[PDB]
Design a protein around this ligand. Structure first.
Ligand SMILES: Cc1ncsc1CCOP(=O)(O)O
Ligand SMILES: C=C1C=NC(C(F)(F)F)=NC1=N
Ligand SMILES: [Mg+2]
Length: 226
């Protein structure tokens, strides 16, 4: 995964979304980079650097942590996505950036990042359609299930939006997020999603490598079976 000179294909994007691990230093009691390394070894197909909150790293310490996480992704051959921070994504030559409804406007971000991967968090049909129009390569829909990892989230929606989007003929790459575990991931894929994203199911697992491997194995099975 080098510098992109063309927009990523939908086929490739959907493959990358399979097991999308997201993490910040304040999401685990273990060593942050070590957990990321274990998740990648287990089978995570994409990683998002999400460092925010009161006890998250800032300044130079945050940048250095990001560099080490990006290096871990490079060693595993997995793309590195930055959450919220467009400047950081450009400065590190990240593979992509993820933004939400309260962040920089998607039109503005797409113009600033060229052909880098762009993900947009959506909670309604209107937002999903707007994201596609603005040039997003994928949308993150949720929260599917209850979650305490992110407090300022909108109402839990199950797989309702995923189903509605596919029903309207929209084929944009979709990843589900919010309280997803190895036990409840199947319905997300069966509803039409191209993958599942998670923080705590892997970051707080007593065995992150095994947890990631389990996710990878079952998601592959579900995608072939739906
Ligand atoms: C970042 C984010 N965005 C919507 S829900 C969520 C949290 C996912 O965390 P967990 O997988 O631990 O529920
Ligand atoms: C709020 C979010 C929603 N979706 C995603 C992703 F999984 F990447 F799509 N990441 C986020 N940080
Ligand atoms: Mg955001």
């Amino acid at each position: 995964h080098g510098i992109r000179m063309t927009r990523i294909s939908r086929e490739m994007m959907k493959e990358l979304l399979s097991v999308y691990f997201i993490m910040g230093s304040n999401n685990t009691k273990a060593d942050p980079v070590t957990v990321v390394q274990k998740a990648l070894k287990g089978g995570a197909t994409l990683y998002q650097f999400r460092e925010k909150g009161g006890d998250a790293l800032t300044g130079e310490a945050r940048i250095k942590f990001a560099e080490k996480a990006q290096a871990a992704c490079r060693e595993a051959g997995v793309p590195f996505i930055v959450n919220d921070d467009v400047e950081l994504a450009l400065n590190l030559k990240a593979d992509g950036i993820h933004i939400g409804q309260e962040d920089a406007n998607a039109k503005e971000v797409r113009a600033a990042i060229g052909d880098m991967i762009l993900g947009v968090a959506a909670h309604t049909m209107s937002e999903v359609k707007q994201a596609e129009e603005d040039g997003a390569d994928y949308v993150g829909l949720g929260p599917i299930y209850p979650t305490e990892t992110k407090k300022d989230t909108r109402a839990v929606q199950g797989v309702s939006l995923i189903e509605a989007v596919r029903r309207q003929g929209i084929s944009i790459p979709i990843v589900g997020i919010g309280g997803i575990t190895i036990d409840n991931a199947a319905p997300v894929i069966q509803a039409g999603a191209d993958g599942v994203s998670m923080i705590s199911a892997i970051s707080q697992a007593e065995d992150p490598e095994s947890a990631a491997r389990k996710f990878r194995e079952e998601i592959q099975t579900y995608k072939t079976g739906r």
